[PDB]
Amino acid sequence: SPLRFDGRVVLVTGAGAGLGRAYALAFAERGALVVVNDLGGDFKGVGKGSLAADKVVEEIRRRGGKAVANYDSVEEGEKVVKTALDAFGRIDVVVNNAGILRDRSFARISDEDWDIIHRVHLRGSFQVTRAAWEHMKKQKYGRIIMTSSASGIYGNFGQANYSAAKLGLLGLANSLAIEGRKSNIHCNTIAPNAGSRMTQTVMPEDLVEALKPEYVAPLVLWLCHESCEENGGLFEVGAGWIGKLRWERTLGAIVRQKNHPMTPEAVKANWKKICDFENASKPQSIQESTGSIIEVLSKIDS
Amino acid sequence: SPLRFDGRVVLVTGAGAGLGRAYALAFAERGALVVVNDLGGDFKGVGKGSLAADKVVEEIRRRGGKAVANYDSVEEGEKVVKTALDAFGRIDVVVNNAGILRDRSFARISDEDWDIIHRVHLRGSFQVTRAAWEHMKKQKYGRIIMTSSASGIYGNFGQANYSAAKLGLLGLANSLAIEGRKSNIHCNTIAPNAGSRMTQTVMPEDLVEALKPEYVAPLVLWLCHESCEENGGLFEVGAGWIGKLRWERTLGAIVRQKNHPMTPEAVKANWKKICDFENASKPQSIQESTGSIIEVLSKIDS
Numbered sequence: 001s002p003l004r005f006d007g008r009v010v011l012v013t014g015a016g017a018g019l020g021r022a023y024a025l026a027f028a029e030r031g032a033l034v035v036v037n038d039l040g041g042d043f044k045g046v047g048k049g050s051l052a053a054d055k056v057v058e059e060i061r062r063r064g065g066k067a068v069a070n071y072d073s074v075e076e077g078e079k080v081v082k083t084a085l086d087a088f089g090r091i092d093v094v095v096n097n098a099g100i101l102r103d104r105s106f107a108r109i110s111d112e113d114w115d116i117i118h119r120v121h122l123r124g125s126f127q128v129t130r131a132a133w134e135h136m137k138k139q140k141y142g143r144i145i146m147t148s149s150a151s152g153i154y155g156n157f158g159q160a161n162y163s164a165a166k167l168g169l170l171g172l173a174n175s176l177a178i179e180g181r182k183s184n185i186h187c188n189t190i191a192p193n194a195g196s197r198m199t200q201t202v203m204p205e206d207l208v209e210a211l212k213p214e215y216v217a218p219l220v221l222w223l224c225h226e227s228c229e230e231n232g233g234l235f236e237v238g239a240g241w242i243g244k245l246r247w248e249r250t251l252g253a254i255v256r257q258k259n260h261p262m263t264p265e266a267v268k269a270n271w272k273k274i275c276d277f278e279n280a281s282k283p284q285s286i287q288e289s290t291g292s293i294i295e296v297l298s299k300i301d302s
Numbered sequence: 303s304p305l306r307f308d309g310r311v312v313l314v315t316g317a318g319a320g321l322g323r324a325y326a327l328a329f330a331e332r333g334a335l336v337v338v339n340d341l342g343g344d345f346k347g348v349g350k351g352s353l354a355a356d357k358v359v360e361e362i363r364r365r366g367g368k369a370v371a372n373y374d375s376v377e378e379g380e381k382v383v384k385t386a387l388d389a390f391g392r393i394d395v396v397v398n399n400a401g402i403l404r405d406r407s408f409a410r411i412s413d414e415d416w417d418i419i420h421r422v423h424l425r426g427s428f429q430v431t432r433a434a435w436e437h438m439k440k441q442k443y444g445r446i447i448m449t450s451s452a453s454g455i456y457g458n459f460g461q462a463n464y465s466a467a468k469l470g471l472l473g474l475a476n477s478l479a480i481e482g483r484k485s486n487i488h489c490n491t492i493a494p495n496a497g498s499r500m501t502q503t504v505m506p507e508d509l510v511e512a513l514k515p516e517y518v519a520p521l522v523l524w525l526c527h528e529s530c531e532e533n534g535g536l537f538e539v540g541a542g543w544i545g546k547l548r549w550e551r552t553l554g555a556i557v558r559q560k561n562h563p564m565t566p567e568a569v570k571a572n573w574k575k576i577c578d579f580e581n582a583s584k585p586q587s588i589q590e591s592t593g594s595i596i597e598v599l600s601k602i603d604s
């Protein structure tokens with residue numbers, strides 16, 4: 001049976017171009033009432049305009065879908081979610097996608113370069129999501145997506161500001177998944193790969209064209225569907241492929257011995273064992289890691 | 303041979319109490335010229351005083367080490383680093399440890415709760431580290447620690463603000479590791495467990511006493527030593543135990559077929575495969591993930 005969104009209010013931030021545009025179209029085609037948010041500025045965080053969101057709303061309506069435009073920056077997240085409440089009377093799905101770039105080597109990152117990346121990516125997603133949250137709890141339904149990146153997950157030369165903001169988003173998502181669960185609110189995180197104005201600088205023209213944002217949209221739609229049970233997952237996605245990430249944790253070493261001072265010399269001596277991933281565990285929660293560490297105290301005293 | 307720090311200028315932020323105090327004392331005992339930074343306020347980010355830093359400087363001096371105090375907030379990271387430059391003429395090791403808590407359910411996190419946590423933890427470590435960076439590069443020597451948390455790595459109810467900031471720090475560490483490497487500048491991240499004023503609220507009294515910050519200091523000193531080769535690692539640590547964390551990534555599923563639109567139905571139908579961690583890879587860099595995703599384009603065309 002086809003996965004539909006009839007009667008679901010779906011907000012996509014940064015929906016004027018690239019991935020967000022692809023999301024907004026794909027949702028509206030499946031019957032979603034779509035809020036198309038876009039500030040309408042450039043990819044470095046300069047400017048503002050109605051045109052970017054208005055062009056997408058028009059496209060959606062031409063294709064026989066339902067959509068309204070929002071022109072506020074995600075920094076004003078309350079105002080963004082207000083459009084959903086005014087136009088459609090509810091908010092069911094939030095796709096946090098809005099983003100910009102300020103690439104620079106570390107010493108060269110200005111205060112402004114840091115703050116603008118963090119206000120848009122991380123604080124922006126927070127603002128938007130907090131605005132939707134109590135509505136989702138009262139309804140007992142929500143589906144939220146955070147947009148991280150490979151540069152956050154792995155690190156990347158010249159992108160310390162951006163990678164900090166992007167992995168911060170994952171940190172946010174880890175906690176939302178926990179707080180939303182009992183209320184049927186899910187939060188999941190994606191690390192997408194797509195040709196766009198943002199990636200034009202780093203990719204050859206033929207790659208930009210080939211790595212289509214419509215290769216990411218099907219994942220977003222699934223993770224945002226009522227029938228989806230995935231919660232608190234992190235996904236890498238592009239080209240038509242999808243994979244999932246998780247932490248693994250070494251068995252490690254108990255370096256401290258009863259009645260003896262723990263020294264950095266014992267850490268150094270035990271370094272290979274500390275870093276050995278053979279039979280690594282797959283920790284599921286804070287309780288699990290925190291609990292096993294605390295039980296180390298009694299193991300030493302035994 | 304004992305691991306010494308004679309002639310190394312070591313800055314510890316938030317060194318007035320808890321883990322930072324334990325690091326400062328441990329460093330100074332091994333000959334380090336220590337800058338003891340502390341704002342001297344409470345654990346929720348209220349207040350300011352010279353007492354916190356002064357106490358620790360005098361304890362170090364009483365034990366026969368060398369130390370000077372700095373009283374600025376890490377928000378003023380240039381001023382904190384300037385103390386090392388003024389007192390000792392260089393900066394060699396930076397332990398970003400300063401932090402506060404603003405626990406609250408998600409809907410209840412105010413703008414001020416968010417901004418203060420992010421200013422201190424994330425923007426603070428950035429300001430401090432950015433101030434040291436060019437000095438480290440010209441010297442061709444640096445050792446940096448970021449302090450994350452299990453709540454950032456796993457998520458935790460009522461800590462969405464903090465967990466965002468704490469995993470943002472890891473994101474920052476991932477990129478610094480890459481940028482610093484060729485200059486003998488290492489950055490590593492720890493997720494510690496220690497009894498302190500911060501953890502008194504969630505742990506019983508006997509546990510606070512048992513989970514000593516002195517069990518974490520030996521890892522920090524090793525990771526900050528000149529003979530340490532570890533760079534870009536993430537470690538969980540407490541009770542006398544240490545472990546290391548890494549990402550694993552499913553082989554995943556190519557769900558797009560040549561000449562057929564990619565659908566959310568095909569994502570759904572392949573969900574088990576996408577989520578299956580059997581023979582999961584262990585991705586080491588952005589190149590590795592990005593490269594293999596791009597390669598999927600030609601695989602579909604073939």
Ligand SMILES: NC(=O)c1ccc[n+]([C@@H]2O[C@H](COP(=O)([O-])OP(=O)(O)OC[C@H]3O[C@@H](n4cnc5c(N)ncnc54)[C@H](O)[C@@H]3O)[C@@H](O)[C@H]2O)c1
Nearest residue numbers: 014016017018019039073074097098099149193194196198
């Ligand atoms: N494209 C990739 O390969 C890639 C990789 C990793 C992460 N990302 C992330 O995915 C998201 C989508 O990016 P894209 O590649 O489609 O870039 P894009 O520039 O094509 O589109 C981003 C959209 O966000 C909008 N935006 C920027 N600031 C805004 C603000 N304050 N308020 C509202 N809208 C704002 C832009 O106007 C634009 O419409 C971004 O968060 C980006 O950082 C993309």
Ligand SMILES: NC(=O)c1ccc[n+]([C@@H]2O[C@H](COP(=O)([O-])OP(=O)(O)OC[C@H]3O[C@@H](n4cnc5c(N)ncnc54)[C@H](O)[C@@H]3O)[C@@H](O)[C@H]2O)c1
Nearest residue numbers: 316318319320321341375376399400401451495496498500
């Ligand atoms: N104790 C744990 O189990 C645990 C777990 C995870 C993370 N952490 C992190 O470890 C670090 C230290 O934790 P702790 O348990 O020792 O806490 P603590 O409160 O005992 O010590 C924190 C110190 O940081 C200082 N500080 C706060 N804001 C500052 C600022 N703006 N500038 C300079 N100093 C400032 C405080 O004055 C205090 O002395 C924090 O980043 C904390 O978030 C601790």
